[PDB]
Amino acid sequence: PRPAPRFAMGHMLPHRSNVGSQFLHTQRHGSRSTWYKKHYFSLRPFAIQRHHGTTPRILLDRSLWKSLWITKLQLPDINRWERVVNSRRVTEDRYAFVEEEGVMHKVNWGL
Amino acid sequence: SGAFGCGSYRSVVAGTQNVPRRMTFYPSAYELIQLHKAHREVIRHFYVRDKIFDNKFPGNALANGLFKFVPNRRENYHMRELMESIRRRSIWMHRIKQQREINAKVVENMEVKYGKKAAASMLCFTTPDSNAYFAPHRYQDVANSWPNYWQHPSVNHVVPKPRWRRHRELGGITRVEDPFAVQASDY
Amino acid sequence: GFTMKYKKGTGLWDEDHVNDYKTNRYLSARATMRWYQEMERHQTRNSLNARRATQ
Amino acid sequence: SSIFSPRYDWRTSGVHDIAPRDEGDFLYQGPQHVLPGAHPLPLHHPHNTITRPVISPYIPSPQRSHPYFTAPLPELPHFSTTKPIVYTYGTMKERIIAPVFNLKNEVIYTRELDPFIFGMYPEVEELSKNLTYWMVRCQNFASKWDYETREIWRKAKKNWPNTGMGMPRVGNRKNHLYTWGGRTKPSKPWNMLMPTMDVKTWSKSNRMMLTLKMLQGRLQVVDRLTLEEPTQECYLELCRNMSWDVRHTGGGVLFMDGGSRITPSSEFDRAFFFGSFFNGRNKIVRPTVLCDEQYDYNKTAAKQRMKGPKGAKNPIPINRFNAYDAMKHDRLVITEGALMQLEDELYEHKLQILPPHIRNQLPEYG
Amino acid sequence: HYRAKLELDRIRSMLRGRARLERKVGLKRLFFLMRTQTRYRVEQQ
Amino acid sequence: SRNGELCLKKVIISYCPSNGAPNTRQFLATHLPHFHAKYPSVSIDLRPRLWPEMAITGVYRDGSERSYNTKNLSPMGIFLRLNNLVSTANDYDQPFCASHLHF
Amino acid sequence: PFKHSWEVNRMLRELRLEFKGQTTIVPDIPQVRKRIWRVRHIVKVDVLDLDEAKALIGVPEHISFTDLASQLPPSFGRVKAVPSPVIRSKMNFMKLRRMRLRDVLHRDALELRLLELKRSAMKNAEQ
Amino acid sequence: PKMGCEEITRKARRVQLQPTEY
Amino acid sequence: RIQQVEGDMFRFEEELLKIFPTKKIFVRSHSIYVYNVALDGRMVLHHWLLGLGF
Amino acid sequence: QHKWNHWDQYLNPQITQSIKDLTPTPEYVGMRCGHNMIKMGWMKIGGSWKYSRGYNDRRRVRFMLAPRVSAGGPRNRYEGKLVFSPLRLSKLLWAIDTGRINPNEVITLYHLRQANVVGEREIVWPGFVLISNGVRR
Amino acid sequence: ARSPLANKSPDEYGNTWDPRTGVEWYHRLRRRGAYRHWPWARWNDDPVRQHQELSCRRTFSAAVTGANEGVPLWNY
Amino acid sequence: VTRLYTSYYTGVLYPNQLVQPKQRLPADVSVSAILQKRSEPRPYVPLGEVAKLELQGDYYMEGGMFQEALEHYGVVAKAYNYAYPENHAQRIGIRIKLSAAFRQTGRLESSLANIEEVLRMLDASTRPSLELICEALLELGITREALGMKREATEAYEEALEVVNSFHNWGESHRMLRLLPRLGRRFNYNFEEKFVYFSPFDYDRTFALVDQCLERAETIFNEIGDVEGAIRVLQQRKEMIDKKFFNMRDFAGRIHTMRGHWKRRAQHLTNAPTPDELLRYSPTIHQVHRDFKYELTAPIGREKEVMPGVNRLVLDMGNPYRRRGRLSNKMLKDADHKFANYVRQ
RNA sequence: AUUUAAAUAAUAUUUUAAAAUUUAUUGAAAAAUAAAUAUAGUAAGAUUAUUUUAGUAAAUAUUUAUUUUUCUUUGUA
């Protein structure tokens, strides 16, 4: 009848500090807390999602689940772009944005 | 032993005189609840002792006729868990039936000494607030028992009445016409 | 040791009084199936074993 | 960063490209201009009634205590509650009457809900106890394993003697300091806590979640959950006809299947339950808001070859009803059988709560 | 402990070679510089 | 604001209509129209996008860009950063010293 | 005052002087002189007779200072001398609480009077 | 403990659940 | 800790102010706290509630 | 930005839309964020450990002037000492007038336990004493 | 410390013949655990008259009732 | 240590010091319009010194000597009269005060005429101060009731309440003040930071004005002998006060002492929805307009309204198990088809 | 037996180091190999997150308490 410990809700796996509990689950020895953080200056990858914790409901091809970045597998076609629309996997054409008349225009990425 | 309303074996050995106790009218409400959830329970025991396999997946379908309890356990469950529960429900029933025997007598004596109306209104349990627990629409102007106290018709005047209207072009959405209040942003 | 065997099949359904620590928040379509199958397999295998043992 | 740190307010330029996109972007016209998304309250999910539709007679309002029929309406048959109704502490103190839907999606007779169940007015602390219980309980504890200093496999010897060297003072380098080492107090399932829930709190919190669903008009009552065939597309047929949205991305549905008014069952209706497996967002739960009392047969250490976590050895099974899945799926569909089962299993509970001067009138009031 | 690495790291372009190159050295130089100028600005200039 | 003309021309507000982090939507509802009515000259452009840059940005008449990060910043704060954008010509930053008081 | 012993500091405190540069006005009664005598190597002093003072601020001659003091609010800043910072805390606290109770008692007074009008109205209407 | 580790690739000991005090 | 209060809890608080003018009071949806008041306070409270008709 | 506090969700449950609103009792501050260091405050993580000596040592872990009395000990249990759990006549009478128990039927320890007037944790051998507390008749 | 000046007001420094030093003398100034209510005999108690006025209003004739008044309690 | 505040002390910066805007009458509405609904059933002036002169004026008035307040207001009114354009707020304000000064001296018709000028000025204004119309017709009320017309006076007060009920936001005054109790992190000292309170009779003058309005009104009713009037008016006054009180409510945050999360004040002082505007604008009544050209997901039948793109291939639902071996892909083979017949038309 | 409360849960407790000990193998006429978490405030060394909001047994720290009278003043528990 003590409320469930909030720190243990799983949203949080900090890196092994001075202070902690016996029931606080911190990460493995020698594995960093945020996956894209290989260095301290390491950026958040842009359209690349890493599904973590739960099985994903929708799994894009260009994202990571129990995986590594394998590029031939991850984006089969580079000229194409993948997105979730109306709860399905869908593929448009990759566009690049270019300044033209003072506005920003979409042109085909590939060519 | 005890556990009926009479007395234990050691009160008989003792020789205490309990026989002509004063009778009073006891509605036995608590014990009716206990009886209800005892009876509710016996049936449960009977259900779970009789579970049998119905398996919806093909691998586990080889057991589909059998009881879920191994026979030796099934029987043990019948002796210990189940038919003790029946004894419990049984005891509750005894303790209630006993007092109806008594209440009848109390009601008769009072009916004679007073008369049906007087007696009936004497044995009534109504508290002035009983409406608050039973039919609250009659208790409303007495006191405000609502969890949402702002919607109770006495304090109701506090909540605002918005002027609202539907909009077709916005998709049938209803939308509130009241002008916003300019907010204090700075110092 | 003492695990409270007497509570084992006791529940109303098949899935309870079963210690299950391996699970998720979102169970997928087929993870759910695996769960319902796991449960009745757990009951079935335990009952069948105990039949085989004592027979 | 944090609002206070000087890191905030970096990127004094570049965050936008100064040029509008020639498609989506637009200038602000004035005060008469309706902006997509713009609302005076901090709504994290800005769903209107188009995106997350509601079924109840009235769109929930501050003027209406709740969005359902307050008195039985003369053009529909009205069924009273299975068990008689008593108003306890945190209950709505008002009549709550909800329409029952057929499986062809027209309304059939109206049915009265019990204010102890669907009327318990929600307050966040309780719902919290429920939710965190769920999210902590539902991890996989077997994966919380890790290596410990004694588990490393090196030689146990002083690896070099410490006297005159400028080297560190070292022996047995299987410590946590070293890339190959492992901790002194590592993580491992038997040390991870599984929280105990008390049946009272589970009852009250669940009932407040139901009532929360009801106050939002996200509640729907149905005759039976039944299909013509065990197949999936019969279920998707059904879902299309009732305008239930089961797509992953749309607001889902939470089914409590009790069977029908006349024939209530604890068990799932086989046909439905089989076709009910579909990749989208939906869930089917048992028709009970109670839970068995939880127990611990190592409340101390006693059984050492226990893998387990420490805690209740009897955690709430996954297909039960809870705060998490009530939040994640919006439309909550309940069969009348389930109504009946709730009312019945909760009845003596709600009776035992009453103050004794009220309780005494119970047999006299019937 | 907070030595203000992240902000001062951006300044390092104002130092000559050994400090401008290697991050730590530069940060020591900048921490020293700023603390000294602060002290001077409050108590002396 | 020099000899009658604001130096600020555009204000660029990007936000997502449906997803999350309400602060900008809130702003657009309550605090923006008051700003528009007070400084009419300034062209405000709204950029709905799925993953909104959580910065506000001004553009000045000499072609100078300036931005303020609004991430999980309250609408009051956003309104304030706007009113900072209007009040600067973005021409210089000198220190405030004795030597620099007379320009 | 940190150059000096704690006695001299308790005196300087009772003269209501915290730091160097501060200035106060105190009465001429014997206790005050007993204080000024002990700190006289720190403090510098100047005297005004109450006529000279009544002039220094334009005060009509027929108005004494007793009534001027009897007018001005006791609530004036840092109202009292109280013994410890906790007591000070709950003095301010009590001040606020008195405000709340003022507005609450206002509302309740209203409800009482309204209840009276409704009772006399129902009693005179039924009768 | 690291994937390539020769340390944890050859199994050493395995710590139990330690017993609590009276 | 005063729990079973249900209604407008703040009016309750505002009578509770007149009973304990000096003490510290807080409201939360479920309950009302009165600090630095022992069994004595419980006795007053119960008198006031009994005499109030509850 | 404003997160919905407990008062707002009480007022208008419409705006409780997600699991992140369900934050627990406001009297939960968070996890323990610092070191409670003897004789200095609560220090900060990555602060000065200069004042931790007593702390570090505390973190790793007269009655002989008084004579013995009564070789068992002063209050001592022995097997078959009679220590009764008290039952106040007040409590019993209250149970009778409230309606837990029947005045009509002879009251055993059993009826007291069934009606719940005494919880199991109170029952131990020998069972109970009857005390008169503040009951003058 | 053991200094003569412990627990004395600066006026009372003059009296050497009664040092206020010692632990419990410090405990009864700051009023600490044993001494929490100090002097156990203070002014405003008199063991003698119990704070009631001794006079005789019991005069036989109600005429002379105040006849014994200001009969002195001590030398005054 | 303890502070004597003997030297000069700069005050603290605290949230109640926010500059609160004057609530305004809406643009379209006219005051004479509601009054007909009632009858139905810049040149340099040393303003610093004249302001000085004015404040001295109502010091005279508050002190009880009215003739002098009259003279002072006379000067100030001549000045403002010259300094501001037609029908400007400051003009109508000061001649309200002038009216009040006349009334108290015994020049009654003077007060009357002046207050009517105030009114027909207020009507001709763009968007007058909501506090000013209120103050104005409270004045007209008192002056009327001194003249010996009690019915009309009553009517004036009643129409004050019936203005403020429709056009005034009750919860606005305290929007910033409401949550301030959550600031204080100390319990056993400085704990009046938890109990901080601000009387509605100060932080908005409007409610105080209408309150005293109805008080005066009810007195008048008690003298005429009208019971239903007295009850109507008292009830109104109550409902006003607790409209006001209801917007100050909240539940306690952490009670006991909390050591140092000091950056959490960012949460406590914000724009927090006022209970008033939380009930008024609740998203089910005032809906969020949600348009689909900016979104990637629509409801079932509306599915082609979604944000367009270049050539699209609907591949499948995103089923995560299509990354595993052949037997796993042997399942989920018929999924997509079945999902296409779910969403058709 | 004159005589007042109560939120029934325990599972945790830094980090690296000797000279040592002990057990079991192998070798030579104590050494090596293999197993353990022995102990180290006078040996020691580390101990991860700025912009802060009350002072200095006896002292200090954490949580908490008392509106006890005079012209002012006061951290007492």
| CA angle (B101, B105, B107) in 5-degree steps | 115
Token look-up 């008689």 returns: D84
CA distances (Å), origin K64, targets K52, K56, K57: 22, 11, 9
Q: Does D44 touch chain L (CB under 8 A)?
A: no
Q: Give the nucleotide at minimum CA-to-C1' distance from J34.
A: M49
Pairing type for strands A104-108 and A95-99 reads antiparallel
Q: Do A86 and D136 touch (CB under 8 A)?
A: no
CB pairs under 8 A between C and D: 68
Q: Do J110 and B2 touch (CB under 8 A)?
A: yes
How is residue B10 written in tokens?
């050691």
Please name the helix (run of DSSP H) or strand (run of DSSP E) that holds residue D222, with its range, or none: strand D219-222
Query: J70 exposed, middle or buried (CB, 10 Å; 0-12, 13-18, 19+)?
Result: exposed
Task: With beta carbons less than 8 A apart as the criterion, state whether J6 and L182 touch.
Answer: no
8-state DSSP, J135: -
CA distance G122 to E42: 78
Closest CA to F60 of F81, F40, F87: F87
CA distance C35 to I28: 41
Task: With beta carbons less than 8 A apart as the criterion, state whether D130 and D138 touch.
Answer: no
Q: Does L287 touch chain B (CB under 8 A)?
A: yes
Answer yes or no: is D2 CB < 7 A from strand M.
Answer: yes
Closest CA to D342 of D257, D253, D252: D257
Answer yes or no: is L14 CB < 7 A from strand M.
Answer: no
DSSP string, I8-19: -HHHHHHHHHHH
8-state DSSP, K11: G
d(CA D119, C1' M9) / Å: 33
CA distance L332 to A59: 14
Closest Cβ opposite residue A65 in set L297, L310, L320: L320
SS3 at position A107: strand
Q: Does J114 touch chain B (CB under 8 A)?
A: yes
The size of chain B, in residues, is 187
SS3 at position B166: strand
How is residue K69 written in tokens?
């008044």
The one-letter amino acid at D78: H
**Contact exists between E and G (3 or more beta carbon pairs < 8 Å):** no
SS3 at position L113: helix
Closest CA to A58 of D274, C26, C34, L301: C26
CA distance A90 to L24: 52
Q: Does I28 touch chain J (CB under 8 A)?
A: yes
Nucleotides of M under 7 A from a protein CB: 1-5, 7-19, 33-37, 41, 43, 46-55, 57-69, 71-77
CA distance A94 to A106: 9
**Contact exists between H and J (3 or more beta carbon pairs < 8 Å):** no
Token look-up 């910065």 returns: F55
Best mutation target, D340, D362, D365, to test chain B (most B CBs within 10 A): D362
Q: B7-32 as b/e, with b when 16 or more CB fall inside 10 Å?
A: bbeeeeeeeeeeeeeebebbbbbbbb
Q: Does J7 touch chain I (CB under 8 A)?
A: yes
CA-based R_g, chain K, Å: 23
In this structure, what are the phi and psi dihedrals at residue D320, rounded to the nearest 5 degrees? Answer: -75, 175
Q: Which residues pair with F2 in a beta bridge?
A: F5
Task: Please identify among residues 295-354 of chain D the ones whose CB lies closer than 8 Å to any CB of chain A.
Answer: none
Q: Do B36 and D347 touch (CB under 8 A)?
A: yes
Dihedral over Cα of J25, J26, J27, J28: its sign: positive
Closest CA to D61 of D165, D179, D216, D200: D216
Q: List the resolution, Å.
A: 7.8
How far J46 CA sits from the closest chain E CA (Å)? Answer: 4
Sequence-ordered alpha helix ranges (H) in L188-334: 200-203, 205-224, 227-246, 265-268, 275-280, 326-330
Closest CA to A17 of A2, A31, A27: A27
Query: D215 exposed, middle or buried (CB, 10 Å; 0-12, 13-18, 19+)?
Result: buried
Cα dihedral C8, C9, C15, C18 in deg (nearest 10): 10
CA distance D65 to D214: 11
d(CA G16, C1' M65) / Å: 29
In this structure, what are the phi and psi dihedrals at residue K28, rounded to the nearest 5 degrees? Answer: -100, 5
Answer yes or no: is D177 CB < 7 A from strand M.
Answer: yes
Please name the helix (run of DSSP H) or strand (run of DSSP E) that holds residue L136, with its range, or none: helix L130-147
Chains in contact with H, where contact requires at least 3 CB pairs less than 8 Å apart? A, D
Pairing type for strands A88-93 and A80-85 reads antiparallel
Q: Does D177 touch chain H (CB under 8 A)?
A: no
* A98 Cα distance to chain centroid: 26
If one counts every other C-beta atom within 10 angstroms of the C-beta of residue B6, the result is 14
Query: G126 exposed, middle or buried (CB, 10 Å; 0-12, 13-18, 19+)?
Result: exposed
Q: Give the nucleotide at minimum CA-to-C1' distance from J32.
A: M49
Task: With beta carbons less than 8 A apart as the criterion, state whether B50 and B77 touch.
Answer: no
Closest CA to the C1' of M5: that residue is I39
CB hemisphere CA count around D39 (13 angstroms): 32
Answer yes or no: is D196 CB < 7 A from strand M.
Answer: yes
Q: A13-45 as b/e, with b when 16 or more CB fall inside 10 Å?
A: beebeeeeeebbbbebbbeeeeeeeeeeeeeee
CB hemisphere CA count around L230 (13 angstroms): 20
Q: Does D26 touch chain F (CB under 8 A)?
A: yes
CA distance L282 to D62: 8
Pairing type for strands D97-101 and D219-222 reads parallel
SS3 at position D92: coil
Closest CA to B4 of J114, D152, D279: J114
Q: Residue I26: its chain L contacts at CB < 8 A?
A: 252, 255
d(CA D149, C1' M45) / Å: 21
Closest Cβ opposite residue J29 in set L254, L273, L284: L254
Answer yes or no: is D185 CB < 7 A from strand M.
Answer: yes
d(CA L267, C1' M74) / Å: 38
Cα dihedral L279, L283, L284, L289 in deg (nearest 10): 140
Task: Please identify among residues 94-123 of chain G the ones whose CB lies closer than 8 Å to any CB of chain L.
Answer: 95-97, 99-100, 102-103, 106-107, 110-111, 113-114, 117-118, 120-121
Terminal alpha carbon distance of chain D = 64
Q: Which residues pair with D107 in a beta bridge?
A: D101
CA distances (Å), origin A38, targets D179, D180, E2: 16, 19, 21
Residues with Cβ < 8 Å from B27, sequence gap 6 or more?
B125, D360, D363, D364, J99
Q: Residue A24: its chain J contacts at CB < 8 A?
A: 31
Residues with Cβ < 8 Å from F92, sequence gap 6 or more?
none
Q: Give the nucleotide at minimum CA-to-C1' distance from L3.
A: M54
Closest CA to G99 of L202, L214, I35, L186: L202
Q: Do D188 and H14 touch (CB under 8 A)?
A: no
Closest Cβ opposite residue D190 in set H2, H11, H17: H17
Closest CA to D118 of D223, D44, D218, D16: D218
Q: Do L242 and B155 touch (CB under 8 A)?
A: yes
CA distances (Å), origin G105, targets C25, G97, G110, K11: 53, 12, 9, 51
If one counts every other C-beta atom within 10 angstroms of the C-beta of residue A110, the result is 12
Q: Does G72 touch chain I (CB under 8 A)?
A: no
Q: Which residue of chain J comes nearest to B100, CA vs CA?
A: J104
d(CA K6, C1' M58) / Å: 13
Best mutation target, J7, J108, J116, to test chain B (most B CBs within 10 A): J108
Q: Residue L253: its chain J contacts at CB < 8 A?
A: 5, 26
If one counts every other C-beta atom within 10 angstroms of the C-beta of residue D221, the result is 22
Closest Cβ opposite residue L291 in set F17, F74, F76: F17
CB hemisphere CA count around A109 (13 angstroms): 11
The size of chain E, in residues, is 45
| CA angle (F77, F81, F83) in 5-degree steps | 115
Q: Residue D125: its chain I contacts at CB < 8 A?
A: 29-30
Residues with Cβ < 8 Å from B147, sequence gap 6 or more?
D90, D91, D92, D93, D121, I6
CA distance A4 to D129: 7
Q: Does E1 touch chain J (CB under 8 A)?
A: yes
How far L132 CA sits from the closest chain G CA (Å)? Answer: 24
Answer yes or no: is L259 CB < 7 A from strand M.
Answer: yes
Q: Return the axis-axis angle of helices L89-105 and L108-123, rounded to nearest 10°.
A: 160
Answer yes or no: is A18 CB < 7 A from strand M.
Answer: yes
If one counts every other C-beta atom within 10 angstroms of the C-beta of residue G61, the result is 8
How far B173 CA sits from the closest chain F CA (Å)? Answer: 16
Answer yes or no: is G115 CB < 7 A from strand M.
Answer: no
